[PDB]
């Protein structure tokens, strides 16, 4: 399978303007017929060249004429000698019953429903599957009344009919251009939530919600979350819904976590299902922001939508920045920065050194569904970002405006997206543009001096990238890096030159620069990258004294947090290298000390000390290290806990006790104490073992809401608390008939630091609740084994990475995106020691010799044995 | 586009 190249974009040779389908609908076999009009705009000798992928033709027609002039390749459909303008007519036969990829048309339970992105439409029918064509689409539907009463496809119902024996259709029609990615089609037996939203001038939109009959308990969050969505962008960016209907149908065969085809989003049903006994406040917060997220979509991604795919970010990167906007306005900005850092330091930097790295604009790409990735989504967001930081909102709001006034019903490039911001800014962003090429992670070293005559504070701030896999040149970039210094009193200190003040937001933009600035008075603690400003590793020889001051009086409550994540850093290293050595937790009691005043702070956000509070995980412990002891960190994140749990006991339970809330409320602030007093109870399940063992046994039969039962029962994992298997066993016994809900308890079980953790996985396999027919049930268990327990995934006899390899041998057969998010972390191998890096080395190398080896799993394998 |  062979690699396309985004320099070797060219425009097409045809376009198509209107496709008209009909589905005669059914699930061992359906009929598919389309009637696209075309226009060649290349050479007469040029082909027509249509993709499809599993399609049974039927037969061809140009201007209703028997077509002879055609062949069938590998994957595709050339026709020859076409006119300038014509009719195309193909009759083709797909099988929704035998699709366990879940690519194009398929089977989620008794429902039919699609999935387009990336390339799938070309598995429905012969197409131009490329996201430059797009056409105007007019979907007529036909199934028996029966199994599939509701026949739901993009845009308005215009058109319906009864047939004999028990048939009916439906023909729909979306008056707005689309690329084929964005086509669905859902048929099935459903229970619709309906409301409406007026938008700000006047539109009344039909707002629809299709859940499996009985779930409509748990739809009126979701409907919630739509209509603050649409009034968030109404508010923030000046954005209204454009058409008469939003549709949103929750399925649980799902691949993906939710997508936003034009007005019939088709969303994961974990992505829509909330209830208090069934939902954590999480859950709560995730459906806001994935609700939200496709709704943004419908301007950034549909409106104007991308002219190829290794313009992917444009959408997806601008989009992540608006939800996460949207979260951030709504509820906690300093708790979503937060988090959101947590994974951009945690996850995405493993991913920008990893033989997968790339920029966020790719230049390579085998298989695209490979490149949904944290590096195209949450740093894509970060370069968003720092164009924001660099435009200030006004400036910011105006190149969207000129974004959407150039290019409004076209396809575009993150190229045309950064140039809008540039003409209705006037910001200079040429050197910029390099942060879209340009893969890995910057490193920013700064260095400081302070002279007392002059009174004069000097930054000198250099920058690299390391070479990466797949890039070897690297060139500085415009890194916007913003600074704020405080004096001793934990003020901050005008900063000024020359007798004029400068702006806080620094353009490093060589490899090596100084920043002077005038009539700094006094001595400064600096809080440098506030707010992370730029996605880089900074490197500065911080004291403990500096980032406790910082914890105290940084003036944004992100940077009080990220003090005390560069506090806690120093330690985690220091006691990593300790456990490698057989020495037990060294931690000196200053440091004890300002995690103490953070509980004991009665002027605190609660939210804020909460994260405080919570320790980095695994994975951002992971990214301090050029190599990776998992075990070490492990080990060393538990005796941490261990500590503060001794030395804060009685601080830990006062402050959980305080938190008390009798009633449960989804609002930021019931969000805050609650999220407090968990991080609380999760110390204290590794303090004393009886006190331990009461308290959360206690928690998990009196909770009234699952935020507060999951995090006793966590504990009681995490801890190995004697209540441990009952509460576990009466969770399976209520819950086990739940999907969604045994989903949480399924990744209980593979993150849990028991010994005999993978045998008990391995059991799962045949749990009631488990099945390899769902990617929801198959994340739960084997990917968070994989992903999430990675001491039990690098057991050094090498058993987490043979299990692996025999779930990957199932699954690249049956559904192949799946089987390449889970073979993600075998391929950092290169990050463990020798003796693993064997181990996983001839795992992949098993896997590379599969029959019928998948290019999703292809492209992944040999970056990572290269 | 959420892929997990
Ligand atoms: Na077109
Ligand atoms: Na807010
Ligand atoms: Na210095
Ligand atoms: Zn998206």
Same mark, same amino acid.
């Given at each position: ?67 002879t002039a055609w062949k069938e390749e590998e994957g595709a459909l050339v026709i020859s000698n076409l006119p300038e303008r014509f009719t195309l007519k193909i009759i083709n036969e797909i099988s929704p019953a035998a699709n366990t990829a879940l690519e ?36 007529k539907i036909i199934a028996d009344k029966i199994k599939y009463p509701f026949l739901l496809s993009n845009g308005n119902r215009v058109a319906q009919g009864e047939l004999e024996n028990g048939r009916h259709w439906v023909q729909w029609q979306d008056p ?183 920029? !966020? ?131 901050? !200190? ?160 006062? !402050? ?166 889970? !073979? ?43 | 586009?959420?892929?997990?």
């Open positions: 399978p062979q690699a396309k190249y985004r320099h070797d974009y060219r425009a097409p040779d045809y376009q198509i303007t209107d496709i008209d389908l009909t589905f005669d609908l059914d699930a061992q076999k359906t009929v598919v017929t389309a009637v696209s009009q075309a226009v060649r705009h290349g050479a007469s000798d040029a082909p027509l060249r249509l993709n499809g992928e599993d399609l049974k033709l039927v037969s061809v027609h140009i201007n209703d004429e028997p077509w194009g048309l398929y089977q989620s339970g008794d429902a039919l429903c699609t999935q387009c992105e990336a390339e799938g439409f070309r598995h429905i029918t012969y197409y131009l599957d490329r996201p430059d064509v797009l056409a105007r689409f007019t979907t707005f251009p689309k690329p084929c990615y964005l086509f669905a089609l859902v048929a099935g037996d459903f229970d619709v939530l309906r409301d409406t939203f007026t938008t700000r001038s006047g539109r009344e939109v039909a707002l629809e919600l299709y859940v499996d009959r009985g779930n409509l308990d748990r739809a009126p969050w979701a409907m919630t979350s739509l209509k603050n969505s649409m009034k968030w962008d109404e508010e923030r960016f000046g954005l209204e819904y454009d058409l008469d209907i939003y549709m949103i149908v929750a399925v649980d065969f799902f691949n993906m976590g939710a997508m936003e085809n034009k007005g019939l989003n088709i969303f994961n049903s974990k992505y829509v299902l909330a209830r208090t006994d069934t939902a954590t406040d999480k859950d709560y917060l995730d459906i806001e922001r994935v609700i939200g997220h496709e709704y943004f979509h419908n301007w950034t991604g549909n409106r104007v939508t991308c002219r190829d795919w290794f313009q992917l970010s444009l959408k997806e990167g601008l989009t992540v920045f608006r939800d996460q906007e949207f979260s951030s306005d709504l509820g906690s900005r300093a708790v979503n920065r937060i988090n959101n850092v947590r994974t951009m330091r945690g996850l995405q930097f493993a991913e920008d050194a990893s033989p997968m790295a790339h920029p !966020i604009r790719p230049d390579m790409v085998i298989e695209m569904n490979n490149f949904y990735t944290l590096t195209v989504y949450e740093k894509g967001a970060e370069v968003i970002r720092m164009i924001h930081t660099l435009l200030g909102e006004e400036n910011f709001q105006k190149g969207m405006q000129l974004y959407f006034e150039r290019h409004d019903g076209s396809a575009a490039t993150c190229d045309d997206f950064v140039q809008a911001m540039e003409d209705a800014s006037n910001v200079d962003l040429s050197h910029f543009r390099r942060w879209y090429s340009q893969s890995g992670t910057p490193i920013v070293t700064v260095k400081d001096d302070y002279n007392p005559e002059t009174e004069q504070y000097t930054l000198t701030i250099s920058q690299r990238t390391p070479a990466t896999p797949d890039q070897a040149e690297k060139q500085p970039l415009h890194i916007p890096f913003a600074i704020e210094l405080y004096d001793n009193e934990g003020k901050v !200190i005008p900063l000024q030159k020359g007798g004029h003040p400068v702006n806080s937001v620094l353009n490093v933009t060589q490899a090596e620069q100084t920043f002077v600035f005038d009539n700094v008075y006094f001595q400064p603690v600096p809080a440098l990258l506030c707010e992370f400003s730029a996605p880089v590793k900074l490197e500065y020889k911080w004291s403990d004294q500096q980032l406790t001051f910082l914890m105290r009086h940084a003036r944004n409550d992100f940077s009080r947090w990220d003090a005390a994540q560069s506090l806690l850093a120093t330690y985690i290293k220091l006691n990593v290298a300790r456990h490698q050595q057989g020495q037990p937790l060294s931690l000196p009691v200053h440091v004890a000390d300002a995690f103490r005043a953070v509980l004991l702070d009665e002027k605190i956000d609660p939210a804020l000390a909460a994260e405080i509070l919570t320790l980095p995980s695994v994975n951002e412990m992971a990214e301090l290290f050029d190599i990776i002891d998992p075990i070490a960190i492990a080990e060393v994140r538990e005796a941490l806990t261990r500590t503060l749990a001794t030395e804060l006991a009685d601080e830990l339970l006062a !402050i959980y006790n305080a938190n008390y809330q009798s009633e449960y409320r989804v609002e930021h602030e019931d969000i805050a104490k609650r999220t407090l007093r968990n991080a609380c109870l999760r110390f204290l399940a590794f303090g004393e073992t009886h006190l331990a063992d009461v308290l959360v046994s206690k928690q998990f039969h009196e909770a009234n809401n699952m935020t507060d039962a999951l995090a006793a029962l966590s504990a009681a994992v995490a801890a190995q608390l004697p209540c441990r298997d009952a509460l576990m066993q009466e969770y399976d016994d209520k819950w086990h008939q739940n999907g969604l809900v045994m989903d949480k308890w399924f990744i209980l079980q593979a993150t849990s630091p028991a010994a005999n953790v993978l045998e008990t996985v391995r059991g799962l396999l045949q749990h009631r609740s488990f099945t390899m027919s769902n990617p929801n049930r198959i994340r739960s268990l084997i990917g968070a084994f994989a992903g999430s327990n990675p001491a039990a995934f690098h057991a050094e006899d090498g058993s987490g990475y043979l299990f692996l390899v025999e779930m990957l041998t199932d699954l690249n057969s049956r559904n192949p995106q799946v089987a390449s998010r889970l !073979i993600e972390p075998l391929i950092r191998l290169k990050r463990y020691d020798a003796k693993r890096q064997e181990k996983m080395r001839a795992a992949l190398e098993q896997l590379k010799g599969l029959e019928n080896l998948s290019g999703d799993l292809y492209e992944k394998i040999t970056k990572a044995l290269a | 586009x959420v892929v997990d």
